[PDB]
Design a protein around this ligand. Sequence first.
Ligand SMILES: OC[C@H]1O[C@@H](O[C@H]2[C@H](O)[C@@H](O)[C@H](O[C@H]3[C@H](O)[C@@H](O)[C@H](O[C@H]4[C@H](O)[C@@H](O)[C@H](O)O[C@@H]4CO)O[C@@H]3CO)O[C@@H]2CO)[C@H](O)[C@@H](O)[C@@H]1O
Ligand SMILES: OC[C@H]1O[C@@H](O[C@H]2[C@H](O)[C@@H](O)[C@H](O[C@H]3[C@H](O)[C@@H](O)[C@H](O[C@H]4[C@H](O)[C@@H](O)[C@H](O)O[C@@H]4CO)O[C@@H]3CO)O[C@@H]2CO)[C@H](O)[C@@H](O)[C@@H]1O
Ligand SMILES: OC[C@H]1O[C@@H](O[C@H]2[C@H](O)[C@@H](O)[C@H](O[C@H]3[C@H](O)[C@@H](O)[C@H](O[C@H]4[C@H](O)[C@@H](O)[C@H](O)O[C@@H]4CO)O[C@@H]3CO)O[C@@H]2CO)[C@H](O)[C@@H](O)[C@@H]1O
Ligand SMILES: OC[C@H]1O[C@@H](O[C@H]2[C@H](O)[C@@H](O)[C@H](O[C@H]3[C@H](O)[C@@H](O)[C@H](O[C@H]4[C@H](O)[C@@H](O)[C@H](O)O[C@@H]4CO)O[C@@H]3CO)O[C@@H]2CO)[C@H](O)[C@@H](O)[C@@H]1O
Ligand SMILES: OC[C@H]1O[C@@H](O[C@H]2[C@H](O)[C@@H](O)[C@H](O[C@H]3[C@H](O)[C@@H](O)[C@H](O[C@H]4[C@H](O)[C@@H](O)[C@H](O)O[C@@H]4CO)O[C@@H]3CO)O[C@@H]2CO)[C@H](O)[C@@H](O)[C@@H]1O
Ligand SMILES: OC[C@H]1O[C@@H](O[C@H]2[C@H](O)[C@@H](O)[C@H](O[C@H]3[C@H](O)[C@@H](O)[C@H](O[C@H]4[C@H](O)[C@@H](O)[C@H](O)O[C@@H]4CO)O[C@@H]3CO)O[C@@H]2CO)[C@H](O)[C@@H](O)[C@@H]1O
Ligand SMILES: *[C@@H]1O[C@H](CO)[C@@H](O)[C@H](O)[C@H]1NC(C)=O
Ligand SMILES: *[C@@H]1O[C@H](CO)[C@@H](O)[C@H](O)[C@H]1NC(C)=O
Ligand SMILES: *[C@@H]1O[C@H](CO)[C@@H](O)[C@H](O)[C@H]1NC(C)=O
Ligand SMILES: *[C@@H]1O[C@H](CO)[C@@H](O)[C@H](O)[C@H]1NC(C)=O
Ligand SMILES: *[C@@H]1O[C@H](CO)[C@@H](O)[C@H](O)[C@H]1NC(C)=O
Ligand SMILES: *[C@@H]1O[C@H](CO)[C@@H](O)[C@H](O)[C@H]1NC(C)=O
Ligand SMILES: *[C@@H]1O[C@H](CO)[C@@H](O)[C@H](O)[C@H]1NC(C)=O
Ligand SMILES: *[C@@H]1O[C@H](CO)[C@@H](O)[C@H](O)[C@H]1NC(C)=O
Ligand SMILES: *[C@@H]1O[C@H](CO)[C@@H](O)[C@H](O)[C@H]1NC(C)=O
Ligand SMILES: *[C@@H]1O[C@H](CO)[C@@H](O)[C@H](O)[C@H]1NC(C)=O
Ligand SMILES: *[C@@H]1O[C@H](CO)[C@@H](O)[C@H](O)[C@H]1NC(C)=O
Ligand SMILES: *[C@@H]1O[C@H](CO)[C@@H](O)[C@H](O)[C@H]1NC(C)=O
Ligand SMILES: *[C@@H]1O[C@H](CO)[C@@H](O)[C@H](O)[C@H]1NC(C)=O
Ligand SMILES: *[C@@H]1O[C@H](CO)[C@@H](O)[C@H](O)[C@H]1NC(C)=O
Ligand SMILES: *[C@@H]1O[C@H](CO)[C@@H](O)[C@H](O)[C@H]1NC(C)=O
Ligand SMILES: *[C@@H]1O[C@H](CO)[C@@H](O)[C@H](O)[C@H]1NC(C)=O
Ligand SMILES: *[C@@H]1O[C@H](CO)[C@@H](O)[C@H](O)[C@H]1NC(C)=O
Lengths: 307, 307, 307, 307
Amino acid sequence: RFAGVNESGAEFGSDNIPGVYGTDYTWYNTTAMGEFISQGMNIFRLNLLMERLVPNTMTGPMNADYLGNLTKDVNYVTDKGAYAMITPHNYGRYYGNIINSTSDFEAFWKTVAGAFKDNDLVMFDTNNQYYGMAGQLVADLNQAAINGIRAAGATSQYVNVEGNSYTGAWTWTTAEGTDGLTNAQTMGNLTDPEDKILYHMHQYLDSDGSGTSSTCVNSTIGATRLMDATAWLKSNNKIAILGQYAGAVNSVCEEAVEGMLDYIDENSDVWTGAIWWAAGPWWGDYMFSVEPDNGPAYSTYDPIILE
Amino acid sequence: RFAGVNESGAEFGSDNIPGVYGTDYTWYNTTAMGEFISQGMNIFRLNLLMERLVPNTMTGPMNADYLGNLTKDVNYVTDKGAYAMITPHNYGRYYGNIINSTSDFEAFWKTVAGAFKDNDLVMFDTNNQYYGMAGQLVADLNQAAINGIRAAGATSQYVNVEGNSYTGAWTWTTAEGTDGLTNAQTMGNLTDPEDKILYHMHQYLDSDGSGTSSTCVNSTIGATRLMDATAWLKSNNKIAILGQYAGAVNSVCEEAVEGMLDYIDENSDVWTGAIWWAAGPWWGDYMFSVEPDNGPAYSTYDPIILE
Amino acid sequence: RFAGVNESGAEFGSDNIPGVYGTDYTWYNTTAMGEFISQGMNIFRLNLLMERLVPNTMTGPMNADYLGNLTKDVNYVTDKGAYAMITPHNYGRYYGNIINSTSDFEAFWKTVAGAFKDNDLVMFDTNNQYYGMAGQLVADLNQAAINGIRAAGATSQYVNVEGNSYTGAWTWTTAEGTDGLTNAQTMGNLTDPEDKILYHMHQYLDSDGSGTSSTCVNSTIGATRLMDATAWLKSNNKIAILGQYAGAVNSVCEEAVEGMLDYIDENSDVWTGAIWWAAGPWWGDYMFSVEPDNGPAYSTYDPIILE
Amino acid sequence: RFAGVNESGAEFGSDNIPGVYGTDYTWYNTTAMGEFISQGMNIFRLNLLMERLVPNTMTGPMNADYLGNLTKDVNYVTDKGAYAMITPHNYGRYYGNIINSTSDFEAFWKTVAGAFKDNDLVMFDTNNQYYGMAGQLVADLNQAAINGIRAAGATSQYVNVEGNSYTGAWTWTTAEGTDGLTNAQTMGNLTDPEDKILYHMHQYLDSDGSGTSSTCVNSTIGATRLMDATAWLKSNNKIAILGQYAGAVNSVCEEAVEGMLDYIDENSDVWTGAIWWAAGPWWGDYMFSVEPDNGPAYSTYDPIILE
Ligand SMILES: OC[C@H]1O[C@@H](O[C@H]2[C@H](O)[C@@H](O)[C@H](O[C@H]3[C@H](O)[C@@H](O)[C@H](O[C@H]4[C@H](O)[C@@H](O)[C@H](O)O[C@@H]4CO)O[C@@H]3CO)O[C@@H]2CO)[C@H](O)[C@@H](O)[C@@H]1O
Ligand SMILES: OC[C@H]1O[C@@H](O[C@H]2[C@H](O)[C@@H](O)[C@H](O[C@H]3[C@H](O)[C@@H](O)[C@H](O[C@H]4[C@H](O)[C@@H](O)[C@H](O)O[C@@H]4CO)O[C@@H]3CO)O[C@@H]2CO)[C@H](O)[C@@H](O)[C@@H]1O
Ligand SMILES: OC[C@H]1O[C@@H](O[C@H]2[C@H](O)[C@@H](O)[C@H](O[C@H]3[C@H](O)[C@@H](O)[C@H](O[C@H]4[C@H](O)[C@@H](O)[C@H](O)O[C@@H]4CO)O[C@@H]3CO)O[C@@H]2CO)[C@H](O)[C@@H](O)[C@@H]1O
Ligand SMILES: OC[C@H]1O[C@@H](O[C@H]2[C@H](O)[C@@H](O)[C@H](O[C@H]3[C@H](O)[C@@H](O)[C@H](O[C@H]4[C@H](O)[C@@H](O)[C@H](O)O[C@@H]4CO)O[C@@H]3CO)O[C@@H]2CO)[C@H](O)[C@@H](O)[C@@H]1O
Ligand SMILES: OC[C@H]1O[C@@H](O[C@H]2[C@H](O)[C@@H](O)[C@H](O[C@H]3[C@H](O)[C@@H](O)[C@H](O[C@H]4[C@H](O)[C@@H](O)[C@H](O)O[C@@H]4CO)O[C@@H]3CO)O[C@@H]2CO)[C@H](O)[C@@H](O)[C@@H]1O
Ligand SMILES: OC[C@H]1O[C@@H](O[C@H]2[C@H](O)[C@@H](O)[C@H](O[C@H]3[C@H](O)[C@@H](O)[C@H](O[C@H]4[C@H](O)[C@@H](O)[C@H](O)O[C@@H]4CO)O[C@@H]3CO)O[C@@H]2CO)[C@H](O)[C@@H](O)[C@@H]1O
Ligand SMILES: *[C@@H]1O[C@H](CO)[C@@H](O)[C@H](O)[C@H]1NC(C)=O
Ligand SMILES: *[C@@H]1O[C@H](CO)[C@@H](O)[C@H](O)[C@H]1NC(C)=O
Ligand SMILES: *[C@@H]1O[C@H](CO)[C@@H](O)[C@H](O)[C@H]1NC(C)=O
Ligand SMILES: *[C@@H]1O[C@H](CO)[C@@H](O)[C@H](O)[C@H]1NC(C)=O
Ligand SMILES: *[C@@H]1O[C@H](CO)[C@@H](O)[C@H](O)[C@H]1NC(C)=O
Ligand SMILES: *[C@@H]1O[C@H](CO)[C@@H](O)[C@H](O)[C@H]1NC(C)=O
Ligand SMILES: *[C@@H]1O[C@H](CO)[C@@H](O)[C@H](O)[C@H]1NC(C)=O
Ligand SMILES: *[C@@H]1O[C@H](CO)[C@@H](O)[C@H](O)[C@H]1NC(C)=O
Ligand SMILES: *[C@@H]1O[C@H](CO)[C@@H](O)[C@H](O)[C@H]1NC(C)=O
Ligand SMILES: *[C@@H]1O[C@H](CO)[C@@H](O)[C@H](O)[C@H]1NC(C)=O
Ligand SMILES: *[C@@H]1O[C@H](CO)[C@@H](O)[C@H](O)[C@H]1NC(C)=O
Ligand SMILES: *[C@@H]1O[C@H](CO)[C@@H](O)[C@H](O)[C@H]1NC(C)=O
Ligand SMILES: *[C@@H]1O[C@H](CO)[C@@H](O)[C@H](O)[C@H]1NC(C)=O
Ligand SMILES: *[C@@H]1O[C@H](CO)[C@@H](O)[C@H](O)[C@H]1NC(C)=O
Ligand SMILES: *[C@@H]1O[C@H](CO)[C@@H](O)[C@H](O)[C@H]1NC(C)=O
Ligand SMILES: *[C@@H]1O[C@H](CO)[C@@H](O)[C@H](O)[C@H]1NC(C)=O
Ligand SMILES: *[C@@H]1O[C@H](CO)[C@@H](O)[C@H](O)[C@H]1NC(C)=O
């Protein structure tokens, strides 16, 4: 049901907060996004920075200029019938410190979700790639995000919940948090009064699953890396989405990507779709970029994403 | 919609204030302007000096002789259906000092607009090429100019707003004022009770975009230099006009001018036209002069402007 | 709302079709209308002949020279913000024959309106002073004209609809067509998808209301002749304009004219204004000419029109 | 050389004849006129209505109360050495109807001039601003007034004679009466056995010379608008006074008024002075009121009148 791209740029220059628009970060190219929608993609994951959207304190007001831009780009996507996922690209951290106030995190999500409560083509993504924290805390932070989003009256939207350890699909049942707990051990019991939780997992294809290398391990590394997570999803009657994945321009990465997408299809009772990492107007010759006018990966993987 | 020429001559000799009409400065050749109007040009940017139009203090009265000459040239253009844009050619400075009193600047513009409030073919250009100031001040000055012009009851006219750093298109998003701010971040904020703001940018084709050299960088320098500004104008839902541009009599410059005007036409949702620099009766063999009886550039670029 | 003058002269020499410009007919003195607009008049009823605008057959093309002059005068007026009413001074006849083809009449008006569809200060005036026909036919012709005007895409302009029997206000409810039917019986049912129908009546002040004698019956003859139509307009929720009226230069006429305009003022809920008959450059010493440079009625009635 | 103001107020509320003193009209503030006199002004044009001084028929007796008040104000002015102009503010009409009986007009003026025959500081002003009449009849009425004034034995007073078309100076040789004759063609053969005829013209400075707009055409409009009349006065060996003129309180009007007053000085061989319109006690905020305590024009133009 979901096939699309990440939009990355509004979280750029994370070293400069708030940073300057047009120098440190940018918002997304709606012309490109419209082309993607015309070709048939129906989801765009819009990445942003917590500290730019709500400066200083998570319980604070929203910056008007940053929120309007977020809203402009969101409306463009949803006005044309595609889903817009709102993703604070913060790794579970605020101003560089692990978010450990669930009360504060809930307040932040009530604030944000309030701004989009009536848009049923919006999705909320609680935080991009929690890492290096207690497994229990990561679960509690997802739950606090759900609480805040629903408390704001946003009841039609799916909430993407992300695991610890960069929410990696291949390590769902193995990677351990600072408390010794895995994602499989802590993420299952999340509850939602609207029962629209989407488990949100990421999967890269190089040795360490980081996406640093342009070398994919082998032609089947993708599908085989989703198997453990797939079993867990079925076992616990959950559904999921692959929020980030990519491979470089070579024949082994291409096959591995095609195979992993084929697998999501054969297991589409638990997998709902996949979102490429990534699009955006400031990527230059980034090896994973599918931005249309200059993304080096566009010509190869645009057709594959369309299936 | 708009295609025409600058008229420059009444701002000449700006080291002599008030100077002597006929010796330091002159007004414009209406016979040549009528010829241009017959060929089909429909805008004339009439340059002048703030200090000659309102001497001593910019809250003061208008010099009758200078204002009378200005009105005569304006009425000649507008009686024949072409636009006449009134351009204080002052770089954001009055008697050589940066204009830092937005109150005073609003009063100047209420004074001037008052003299043309019922001519709906008049354009108001807040000031030619602000440079070397704060970006916020330049924006605030443009705003104070809009406020003054409307307060005078001049409600039908477009107000041309010019940015800092010589309002260059190619640097709209990168060049910084004395406060590190760029035109992009500061100039969007402007509002107009009559929603008739026209962003007014200039584009030269030599290496430093100063128009000093007869050599244009290459055959595609114009179009490629309008791209950044064009993105900004679409993203921010604004419209603009290229108020100054030129190239010299050689094949590379000529091809460069053609390419940038073709680009303007392709992107005519945001670009409304372009005004050549320049015409006028005292240019002699100035490389960029398209004055009909005299201008080395007339035979080459007059046809190109007409399209 | 509307206060102005007829312009008469392009329909002169009705006995010579096509006739010769400058011999049989003329167009209007823009300098004269410019003065009227300075004074505050905001409507000019521009009279012409259908046969000179659309020669030979009502379905045909327009005559370019006659159309060119009409658009010149129209544009001069509307460019200064006044309304220009376009009026075929044809009495319901075409080449002297009563117009029976509602199909051709609609085609004629679609052609004419097309040339002015985007000028939202034009008004269309279906035909001057129908007379000697069936009441129902006059209504049908007015409806056909409305249909054609709207079908040409002229949706912003008022359509002035004129009744039978010289569209006299004083006989609106009494004078019968050749079918025994009055204007009040037949003109109520006119429809317009833009809801911009302006009922267009005329009122002279001599015994037989023909406006051919300089004697006005008495000092209140004007307002009293309007009361029957005023009641019909209120009872039928229509609005109207007095497209022609005149008194001669004498005290009883002057008083009678003021009293009627005063009446129109007090009944402005249904009377939108009044248009004097007439201005124009070829009237000489016509009893009713308010042409400034030589109209005998100017000094008396110019101030009265302005209120 | 005469320099002073109009007194206007006893002619107010001209729609109520006789009207009620203190409700419809008033007489003048002698204390304010004494002030004007001590500053050096030496002429006061006292406006009234024929019908309130001589009711019912022009051959009738005077109204004691209205005459008594006129006599009070006249005597206050002349007892301090200043001239008092007696001016019926009637536009050549009696009870609203144009005066056709030169016999009655002469009788009216004989009656009025008798009440003042020995006061050699009074002037008589045959009627204010004839308009819309035959030029020959306006001349005949001025002669009849002269004839009646002298027949009364009032042989020392100047008789101010006013032309047709609002006795406008700028139209003296161009505006035609209903008989096709101008003031220049008809006003030149008036005779006086005492040879004290003063030609009495009016000049406002707005576009249509109506004196009803606060905008003056330009800084020289007053002087240029008097030159046709000056050449006529010089060539026909007549002398004149400008019995009404005014500008609003704005820089253009101020210069126009000043320049016209210098023109009169430079042409004092034919122009004897100028009377401002206007002073008086019920003007309130009238744009031309030079009434001391109340008049918005007093501060600016009081000094200008005094020279
Ligand atoms: O491009 C015109 C614009 O550029 C501005 O400078 C840009 C640099 O051109 C650009 O290289 C840089 O982009 C960085 C970005 O800052 C990082 O935040 C981002 O980090 C990526 C990371 O590299 C990926 O591996 C990971 O997967 O994702 C994160 C993002 O979530 O990497 C990119 C690309 O290397 O950003 C600069 C601005 O911050 C100029 O300043 C401006 O003037 C120009 O107009
Ligand atoms: O996914 C995109 C995300 O990646 C981040 O990079 C992460 C990888 O996501 C993550 O998988 C990787 O995990 C490493 C881990 O750090 C090592 O400690 C562990 O080492 C294993 C070893 O492989 C075993 O052989 C040995 O027996 O045990 C040790 C552990 O005891 O290996 C895993 C992967 O195999 O770490 C990466 C970062 O270091 C990026 O940083 C981020 O930017 C991307 O968005
Ligand atoms: O022409 C007869 C007239 O000449 C007067 O002297 C003239 C010079 O002849 C004329 O060259 C000179 O023109 C200068 C002008 O002073 C500068 O202000 C102007 O600056 C230009 C600049 O050169 C351009 O590169 C830039 O794009 O624009 C600015 C203007 O905005 O440059 C011109 C040409 O170099 O002006 C003199 C008067 O000021 C005589 O005095 C007189 O007697 C003669 O009748
Ligand atoms: O446009 C008509 C107007 O031009 C004026 O001439 C201006 C140019 O318009 C302006 O673009 C140019 O700007 C220079 C700037 O001063 C330099 O500091 C800068 O140098 C860059 C360098 O290129 C980079 O490599 C490095 O990073 O440092 C700096 C960036 O910080 O380069 C630009 C060149 O584009 O300056 C000209 C002179 O002021 C005319 O003066 C005026 O008369 C014309 O009307
Ligand atoms: O002779 C000079 C000039 O005249 C042109 O024709 C003029 C007529 O001179 C002028 O009287 C006439 O004014 C008409 C107007 O056209 C009608 O719209 C209006 O209709 C009358 C109708 O004529 C009467 O018979 C009838 O009873 O009623 C209506 C009004 O209720 O009446 C006015 C006058 O009252 O306009 C003509 C031009 O349109 C000649 O064409 C030209 O050649 C001559 O040089
Ligand atoms: O003040 C107390 C008094 O007021 C009476 O009401 C007065 C109004 O106060 C007064 O403003 C109004 O004045 C009119 C006057 O009626 C008109 O006749 C006169 O016409 C002017 C015209 O405005 C000029 O444009 C033209 O040039 O000249 C003529 C004059 O010749 O205009 C003035 C102002 O518009 O008159 C009212 C009375 O008639 C009260 O009724 C009374 O009770 C109060 O005590
Ligand atoms: C925006 O996307 C369109 C469509 O791919 C592309 O043509 C255009 O160049 C992009 N704009 C920028 C500024 O990158
Ligand atoms: C986007 O951000 C810029 C800079 O902060 C701001 O000026 C602009 O108004 C924003 N856009 C919207 C739609 O708010
Ligand atoms: C969370 O971080 C706080 C700092 O805000 C610190 O006291 C401690 O590490 C944690 N406290 C709680 C209550 O979780
Ligand atoms: C691909 O690599 C993974 C991880 O090393 C391994 O489990 C899998 O068997 C490999 N597949 C093939 C076909 O070599
Ligand atoms: C004015 O322009 C005309 C037409 O281009 C030209 O012939 C004439 O020489 C010019 N006059 C001057 C003084 O430059
Ligand atoms: C233009 O200025 C000159 C120099 O003072 C002056 O003589 C001339 O009158 C002015 N022209 C107009 C139309 O005012
Ligand atoms: C404007 O500039 C002058 C110096 O150039 C400075 O003294 C003054 O305080 C400034 N005004 C403001 C409001 O900053
Ligand atoms: C921005 O614009 C608003 C309204 O146009 C104005 O009140 C404000 O002072 C401006 N300032 C900045 C920094 O944008
Ligand atoms: C022209 O020069 C500019 C600046 O050096 C460059 O960006 C552009 O690519 C050049 N165009 C061509 C066709 O080489
Ligand atoms: C045109 O109108 C002007 C303004 O009233 C007038 O002065 C002029 O005489 C008219 N021209 C003709 C040819 O009637
Ligand atoms: C007006 O009509 C005359 C006669 O045909 C023609 O010469 C002239 O070009 C016309 N004017 C316009 C503006 O079409
Ligand atoms: C129009 O009216 C009737 C149709 O009912 C017909 O007899 C008459 O001849 C027609 N006349 C013209 C001029 O069309
Ligand atoms: C004016 O004349 C009309 C028609 O004869 C008449 O109905 C009306 O009563 C007259 N008015 C007066 C006041 O006699
Ligand atoms: C009469 O004039 C005097 C002197 O200007 C002034 O003080 C007083 O208010 C005036 N009275 C009236 C009723 O206008
Ligand atoms: C002025 O008129 C009033 C009202 O009729 C009257 O009472 C008063 O006596 C008159 N004044 C003089 C001096 O006659
Ligand atoms: C006299 O007044 C009558 C109105 O009763 C008018 O018709 C006439 O024109 C006037 N005088 C002359 C000489 O015509
Ligand atoms: C002032 O206006 C008059 C009338 O339009 C005109 O004749 C005269 O030339 C104008 N004066 C100036 C200096 O423009």
